[PDB]
Amino acid sequence: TVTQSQPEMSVQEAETVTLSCTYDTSESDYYLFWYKQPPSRQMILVIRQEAYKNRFSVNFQKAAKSFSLKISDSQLGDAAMYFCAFMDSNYQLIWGAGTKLIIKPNIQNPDPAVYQLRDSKKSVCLFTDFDSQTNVSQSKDSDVYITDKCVLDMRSMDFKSNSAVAWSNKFACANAFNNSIIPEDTFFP
Amino acid sequence: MIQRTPKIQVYSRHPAENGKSNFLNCYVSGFHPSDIEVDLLKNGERIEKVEHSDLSFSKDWSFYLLYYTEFTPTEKDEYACRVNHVTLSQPKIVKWDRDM
Amino acid sequence: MDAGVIQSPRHEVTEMGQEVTLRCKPISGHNSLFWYRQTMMRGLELLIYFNNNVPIDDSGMPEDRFSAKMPNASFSTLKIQPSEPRDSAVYFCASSRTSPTDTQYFGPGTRLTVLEDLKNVFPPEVAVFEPSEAEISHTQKATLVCLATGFYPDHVELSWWVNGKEVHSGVCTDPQPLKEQPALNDSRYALSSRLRVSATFWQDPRNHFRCQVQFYGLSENDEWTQDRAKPVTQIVSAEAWGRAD
Amino acid sequence: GSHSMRYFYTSVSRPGRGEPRFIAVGYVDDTQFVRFDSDAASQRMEPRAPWIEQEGPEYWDGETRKVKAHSQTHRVDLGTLRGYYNQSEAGSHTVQRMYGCDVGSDWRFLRGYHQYAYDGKDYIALKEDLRSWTAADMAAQTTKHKWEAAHVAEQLRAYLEGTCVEWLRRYLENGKETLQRTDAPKTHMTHHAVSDHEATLRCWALSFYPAEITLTWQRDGEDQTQDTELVETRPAGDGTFQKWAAVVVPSGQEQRYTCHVQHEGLPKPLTLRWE
Amino acid sequence: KQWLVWLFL
Numbered sequence: 157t158v159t160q161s162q163p164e165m166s167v168q169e170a171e172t173v174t175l176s177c178t179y180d181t182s183e184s185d186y187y188l189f190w191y192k193q194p195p196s197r198q199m200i201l202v203i204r205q206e207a208y209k210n211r212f213s214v215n216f217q218k219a220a221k222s223f224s225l226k227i228s229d230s231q232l233g234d235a236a237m238y239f240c241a242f243m244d245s246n247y248q249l250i251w252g253a254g255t256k257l258i259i260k261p262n263i264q265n266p267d268p269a270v271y272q273l274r275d276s277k278k279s280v281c282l283f284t285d286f287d288s289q290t291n292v293s294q295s296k297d298s299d300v301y302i303t304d305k306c307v308l309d310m311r312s313m314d315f316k317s318n319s320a321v322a323w324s325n326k327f328a329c330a331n332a333f334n335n336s337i338i339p340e341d342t343f344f345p
Numbered sequence: 346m347i348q349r350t351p352k353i354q355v356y357s358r359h360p361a362e363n364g365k366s367n368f369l370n371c372y373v374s375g376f377h378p379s380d381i382e383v384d385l386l387k388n389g390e391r392i393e394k395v396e397h398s399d400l401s402f403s404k405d406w407s408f409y410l411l412y413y414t415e416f417t418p419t420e421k422d423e424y425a426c427r428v429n430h431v432t433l434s435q436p437k438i439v440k441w442d443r444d445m
Numbered sequence: 446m447d448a449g450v451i452q453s454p455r456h457e458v459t460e461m462g463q464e465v466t467l468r469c470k471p472i473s474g475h476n477s478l479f480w481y482r483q484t485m486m487r488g489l490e491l492l493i494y495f496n497n498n499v500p501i502d503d504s505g506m507p508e509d510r511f512s513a514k515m516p517n518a519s520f521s522t523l524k525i526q527p528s529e530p531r532d533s534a535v536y537f538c539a540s541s542r543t544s545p546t547d548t549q550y551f552g553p554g555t556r557l558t559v560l561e562d563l564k565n566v567f568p569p570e571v572a573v574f575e576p577s578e579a580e581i582s583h584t585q586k587a588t589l590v591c592l593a594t595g596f597y598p599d600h601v602e603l604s605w606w607v608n609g610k611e612v613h614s615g616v617c618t619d620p621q622p623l624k625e626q627p628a629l630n631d632s633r634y635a636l637s638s639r640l641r642v643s644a645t646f647w648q649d650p651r652n653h654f655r656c657q658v659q660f661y662g663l664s665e666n667d668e669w670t671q672d673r674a675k676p677v678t679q680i681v682s683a684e685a686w687g688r689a690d
Numbered sequence: 691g692s693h694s695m696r697y698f699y700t701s702v703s704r705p706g707r708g709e710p711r712f713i714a715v716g717y718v719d720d721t722q723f724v725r726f727d728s729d730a731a732s733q734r735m736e737p738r739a740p741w742i743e744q745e746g747p748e749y750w751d752g753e754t755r756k757v758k759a760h761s762q763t764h765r766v767d768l769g770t771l772r773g774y775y776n777q778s779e780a781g782s783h784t785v786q787r788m789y790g791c792d793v794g795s796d797w798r799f800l801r802g803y804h805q806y807a808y809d810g811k812d813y814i815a816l817k818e819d820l821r822s823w824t825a826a827d828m829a830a831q832t833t834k835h836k837w838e839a840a841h842v843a844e845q846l847r848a849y850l851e852g853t854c855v856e857w858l859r860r861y862l863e864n865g866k867e868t869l870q871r872t873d874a875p876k877t878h879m880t881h882h883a884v885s886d887h888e889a890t891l892r893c894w895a896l897s898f899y900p901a902e903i904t905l906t907w908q909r910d911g912e913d914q915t916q917d918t919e920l921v922e923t924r925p926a927g928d929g930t931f932q933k934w935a936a937v938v939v940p941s942g943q944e945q946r947y948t949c950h951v952q953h954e955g956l957p958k959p960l961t962l963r964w965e
Numbered sequence: 966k967q968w969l970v971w972l973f974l
Contacts, residue, residue, distance in 0.1 A: 182748060183748075183752065184853050184856070184966070185849070185853055185969040187546055189548075195620035195621075196553075197483075197535060197553070197554050198551065198553055198554075199537065199539070199551035200551070201548050201549075201550075204548055206845070208844075208845060208848035208849075208852065239489075243545070243546060244969075245751075245752040245755045245756055245969060246755065247501075247502070247544075247545045247546065247755065247759065248491050248494075248502065248545065249489075249491065249545075249549070251488060251489045253488075254488075267583070267584060269579075269580070269583060269584075271576075271577040271579050271580045271588075272577060273574035273575060273576065273577055273588075273590050274574060274575065275572050275573075275574055275575075276572075276573055276574070276575055276683075276684075276685045277572065277683075278572065278574070279574075280574045280590050280592065282577075282580075282588055282590060282639070284580075284588060285584065298626070298627060298628065301623060301625070301635060303619050303623060303637045304619065306617035306618070306619065306639065307617060308615050308616060308617035308639060308641055309614065309615070310614055310615040310641060310642075310643075311614045311615075312614060313643065317641065319588065319617060319639050319641075321590055321592075321637045321639065323592065323637075343583065345577075345579035345583070346781075346783075346809045346810075347809060347810035347811055348810075349810065352922060354921070354922070354924050356924065356932065358926045358927045358928060359926075360896075368927050368928075370924070370925075370926070370927055372922075372924045372925060374922060374924075375922075377784075377809075377810040378702065378782070378784050378809075378810070379700060379702055379711075379713075379784065380702070380782075398722075398925075399713065399715045399722065399725045399727070399738070400700055400713040400715070401698045401700075401715045401717075401722075402698060402700065402786060402788075406786055406807045406810045406811070406812075407810065408700070411924075411925050411927060413927050444880075444882065445880065445882075445892065445934075476766075496762060496766075496971075497762075497765075497766045497769075499762060499765070501762065543971065543973055544970075544971035544973075545971075546969070546970065546971060697967055697968075716967075752966075753966070753967055756967040756968070756969065757967060759971055760967070762971070763971055763972060763973055766973055767973060767974040770973065770974050771974060785974070789968065806974060813974070814974075833974050837972075842970075842972065845970055846968070846970075846972075849968050849969075849970075853966050853968075853969075854966070854968075856966075857966040
C-alpha cells in the first residue's frame with residue numbers, strides 16, 4: 157500500500173513544493189511511480205524510479221520507504237491530482253490516495269471588485285481581480301450558486317487574474333458573497 | 346535445429362540383492378528436443394506405475410530425465426528400458442545388466 | 446501521426462440493458478494493453494491487461510457482465526452486456542511497450558454514464574452575459590461570462606469562439622460542474638466560464654463573441670417518443686456582439 | 691567453498707495444439723528445490739526440497755507469478771524467433787533460458803550467468819563482465835541491440851549480485867543440513883572375465899554428493915586413458931550420484947591396474963587394487 | 966528467488 161499523507165496542498169507560483177509518499181511492502185524488488193492527472197482526466201507519468209538505482213525530482217529513501225516528489229518553480233499548469241504508484245511481483249499498479257496540488261498565482265496589482273453582468277437576449281455577479289489568499293466559499297443558502305475561483309491568463313497582455321461567478325434569480329451583488337471573507341479594499345460599483 | 350540421440354542407462358539405486366526392495370532407474374541424457382517416450386519393462390511388459398524427474402538440461406542445452414519405479418529383483422525376472430525418440434529409427438531397448 | 450493511446454467513443458450515454466462496446470487502439474510499437482476504470486469512491490481499478498494479445502490478468506473484471514478481447518496487436522475491445530447504472534465510470538485504456546513494469550501511457554478515457562431511464566436527459570441552456578461598464582472604466586478590461594444551466598448528465602465541453610476562431614487565452618472554465626439542487630442525489634448540473642479581453646477590443650462592434658457548449662446525450666438509434674426535443678448529442682450556443690459604448 | 695543457484699526454463703511450441711509446453715526448475719548446487727509444469731494441474735510453483743517448504747505463502751505466490759511471467763516471455767520468444775529466422779508456422783521449436791549466481795568461500799558474490807538457446811544452439815549469453823552480450827548471428831545481434839538499449843545488463847547485474855545471492859545465502863543456511871553436507875563415495879571393484887584373452891575390471895563409485903567426481907585407471911603408475919570406458923555420472927534417485935569406470939585387462943594381469951577416485955568428500959583420493 | 970523482470974528476445 158502507498159501512503160500520500162496530506163490529500164491536498166497549496167503552493168504559491170514560482171515556489172517549490174514537496175509531495176510525500178511512503179509505501180509498505182515485504183518484497184525485495186519493486187517499482188515506484190509518480191503519475192499526474194489534470195482536470196482533463198489524462199493520466200501522464202511524472203517520474204519513474206526502479207529500486208536498484210526538470211522542475212520535478214524525487215528524494216528516494218530506500219531506508220525509510222520514502223518516495224517524495226519535489227516540484228521547483230511551480231507553474232500554473234502543474235495544478236492536478238498527483239498519484240504515487242508502486243508495483244511488485246503482482247505486476248499491477250498499486251495506487252495511493254492521491255494529492256491535489258493547487259497553485260496560487262502571483263498577481264502584481266490586486267484590484268478586487270464585484271461587478272453585475274446582464275444577459276444579452278437574468279443577472280450574474282463577477283468577483284474578480286483579488287489576490288490568491290482570498291478564498292471563495294459556497295453560499296449557505298441553496299437558492300444561490302457560487303463557483304470556485306478560476307485563474308485566467310491573458311497572454312498577449314501578460315496579465316493573469318482570479319475570478320469567481322455568483323448567480324441567482326430570487327439577489328444583489330453587494331451581498332452575494334457574504335459567506336466569503338472578501339477583501340476590505342473591494343470595489344462595489 | 347539440432348537433434349541429439351539419447352544416452353540410455355538402466356541401473357538400480359542400490360546394489361541389487363535378490364528379494365530386497367530397490368528402485369529401478371532408466372537415466373536418459375544428452376538428447377534434443379525434449380519430446381521423448383520412456384517405458385520400464387518387466388519381461389517385455391510395460392511397468393505401469395512409473396514416475397520421472399522434472400525436465401532440465403546440461404551446459405550444452407541437452408535434456409536429461411530419470412525414470413524410476415519401486416521393484417524387487419529376482420533371479421528369474423529380467424528388466425529393461427524402452428525409449429522412443431525422433432532420432433531413433435526404431436524404439437531402442439536397453440536391458441538392465443545386473444552383474445556389472 | 447498525432448497519436449498516443451486511442452479510445453472510442455469519447456462519451457457514451459445509454460440506458461440499462463443496452464450493450465456497451467468500448468474500443469481501444471494502443472500506441473504502435475506497444476505490446477501490453479491495459480483496461481482501467483476510475484470513479485470517485487473506488488478510484489482507479491485495473492480491470493484486465495493483455496500482453497502480446499494474451500490475457501494475463503482479469504481478476505479486476507466483474508463476472509459474466511464484462512468481457513474483454515484483443516484480436517490484434519493494435520486493437521482491443523471491452524464489452525458490457527447488459528449494462529447497469531453501477532457501471533457508470535471513466536474507462537481508461539493504457540499501453541506499454543513490452544511488460545506491465547514498463548511505463549504505461551493512458552488514453553483520454555471513455556466517460557460512460559448508464560442511466561435508469563433516458564427521460565432524465567436534458568441538454569443545457571446556454572447564455573452569454575456581457576461585460577459591465579464599471580469594469581471597463583475601472584480596469585480597461587472586459588469579461589464576458591457564459592453560463593450553461595440545467596443539463597444532465599454532466600457530459601459537457603465548453604469552448605469560446607471569436608469571429609469564427611476558437612480562443613484559448615483569457616478563458617477560465619469551472620473544472621467541475623455544480624449541482625443545481627445539491628441536496629438531492631440525482632440533480633441537473635450547471636457550468637460557468639469567463640472570457641476576458643481588452644476593453645478596447647470589446648468596444649469594437651465588428652467583433653463577434655460566441656460561447657459554445659458541446660453536450661453528449663442520446664444517439665439517433667435510441668428511441669424517443671415524447672413531446673420534447675430529443676436530448677441528443679448537440680451543440681447549444683449563445684452569442685453576443687461587441688458594444689461601442 | 692563455492693555455491694550456486696540456477697534456474698532452468700524450457701518452452702516447446704506445439705503448433706496447432708494450443709499453447710507451448712513450459713517447464714521450469716530451480717537448483718541450489720546439485721539439489722533441485724522448485725518446479726513448474728505448464729500442463730500440471732496445480733498451475734503453481736511447487737517445492738522439491740524440504741528446506742524450501744518452510745517458506746510462506748508470499749514466497750510461493752510470488753514465484754508462481756514470476757514463473758508464469760517467464761512462461762509468457764518464452765511463449766512470445768517462440769513467435770519472435772520464428773520471425774527472426776523466417777521459419778514455417780508448422781514446425782515445433784524450443785527456447786531454453788538459464789540464469790543464476792555463484793557465491794564464493796567468503797559467502798559474497800562470485801559469478802553470474804544468464805543465457806538463452808534456440809533449438810539446442812546458443813542464441814545469446816551474458817559475458818563474464820556482466821556488462822556485455824555475445825551474439826552469434828544477425829538475430830542475436832537484434833536482441834543484443836534491443837537489450838543494450840534497455841540497459842538490461844544493468845538491471846540483471848543488479849539482480850545477480852543482489853536478490854540472487856541474498857536468497858542463495860538464505861537457502862544455504864535453511865538447508866544447511868543437506869546443502870552443506872558432503873557424501874563421500876562408497877567404492878568397490880568388479881571383475882568379469884570376457885575371455886581367456888582378457889578380463890574386465892570395473893571401478894564403482896556410489897552414493898556420493900555433489901556430482902563432481904573424477905575416476906582414473908592406472909597400469910603400473912601410468913595413466914590408462916585409452917582402453918578405458920567411462921560412464922556418465924548418473925543420479926541414484928535419492929539425491930546422490932553414481933559412476934563407474936571400466937578397463938579391459940589381459941587375464942593374469944589384474945593386479946597391475948589401479949583405480950583412483952577423487953571427490954571433495956574424501957580427504958585423500960582413494961586407491962583401489964584387485965590384489 | 967527468480968528475477969522480477971520480463972525479458973523478451
